[PDB]
Design a protein around this nucleic acid. Structure first.
Lengths: 222, 222
DNA sequence: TAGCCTGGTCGA
DNA sequence: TAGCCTGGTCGA
């Protein structure tokens, strides 16, 4: 790939990796669902290489004790964890802008505590007492859900139908039922649908459909 | 310590480690808060040693690539994670029985979905339409909370004042306010109170106080 | 396969 | 220091 000069030394930020990765996308596959999965794959491959230049030398020369091993073990695991999550946020932000969805707030304050990944169409409209509450949207983003999905709930007391975007290779049917009852709606990249139980597949939204719904919903907003 | 014979080979269960660990407790420090922290420390030290006999040899001879390193790295990290959590559950179960708290359900079904770590005084009383709902208690257990605490919420729709037991070395004041509003009440081992902000320390329960409250609350139940 | 998190890194 | 989880192990 040939990386930027100081990357060998200083480990780049999430936006920096992607900023570099952008000049290496396949192009075009103008479907938003295709684009995400592709941009993720390209970004990840670059990340793998940067990671190697920081650890591979330490990896080979072994560890004298468990406490030594596990410190870097946790450090490296948790580097991936923190960066994987921010990556998906960023990739969706870029895709919203590129596909006509300009009406969204990134760091939007709702009730004063929890702040959702994405709020629609505005932080302002959300507090606007005369904006139709049923036209409000919220997008929580989780690369994997597992048990962690329930942490997304009351991020927007005002919105009961909440959207969760995830890359998980199938959510259990039992687990999906809990999500429905709690008012959660999955947005999942078209390609990953086949990993979800047949009964669930029907109620699954693609990224493309999400963007299209919201684009029309807020077309009448400046 | 000298471990049981087959431990070198087969990695023991959580109950097995503790069953062995019990014959190695300090004794007595009859305070429940003291006993937990001690039994945890004894259990952990044994765990560390069992872990070493399974990994130390693999740890020293290094790794050829990142993908090799990270597989065991995640495996070992996640062994600790799964076992740490079950350990605390077990230690509290044993302490409840030993200190007169016989009225609790371990695997209690509430609404049919989420099942709380501990339900009081009975799975039956919880569904008993004439048991005073304000005398119901529920105990979620988390070794560390972090962001994960919000996953404990609606485990018992019927109970609004919920108890969370944790070993975390201080919960932020901002984070504690969210817990209060969501109807969560911390139970924290006496010794760890000094790690919590001064403003929070006041509303913190000890294990001893928890057991004493519930013991009196259910003394009139067979 | 639901729950665990003997948890450090990243970027407001 | 709040949010992340490019997540596998354990035991119903």
């Amino acid at each position: 790939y040939i990386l930027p000069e100081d990357w060998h030394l200083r480990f780049p930020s999430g936006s920096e990796i992607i900023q570099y990765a952008a000049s290496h996308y396949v192009k075009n596959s103008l479907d938003p669902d295709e684009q995400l999965l592709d941009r993720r794959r390209v970004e990840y491959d670059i990340f793998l290489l940067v990671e190697e230049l920081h650890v591979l030398d330490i990896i080979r020369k072994g560890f004298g004790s468990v406490d030594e091993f596990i410190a870097l073990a946790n450090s490296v695991s948790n580097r991936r964890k923190s960066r994987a999550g921010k990556s998906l946020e960023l990739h969706l932000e870029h895709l919203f802008i590129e596909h006509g969805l300009r009406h969204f707030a990134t760091q939007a304050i709702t009730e004063g505590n929890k702040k959702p990944d994405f709020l629609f169409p505005s932080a302002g409209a959300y507090h606007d007492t005369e904006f139709p509450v049923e036209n409000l949207r919220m997008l929580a983003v989780k690369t994997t859900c597992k048990d962690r999905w329930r942490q997304i709930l009351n991020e927007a007391d005002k919105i009961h139908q909440v959207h969760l975007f995830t890359l998980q290779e199938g959510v259990s049917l039992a687990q999906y039922r809990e999500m429905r009852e709690s008012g959660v709606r999955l947005v999942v990249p078209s390609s990953l649908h086949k990993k979800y139980p047949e009964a669930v597949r029907a109620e699954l939204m693609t990224l493309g459909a999400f963007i299209a719904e919201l684009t029309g919903l807020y077309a009448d907003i400046p």
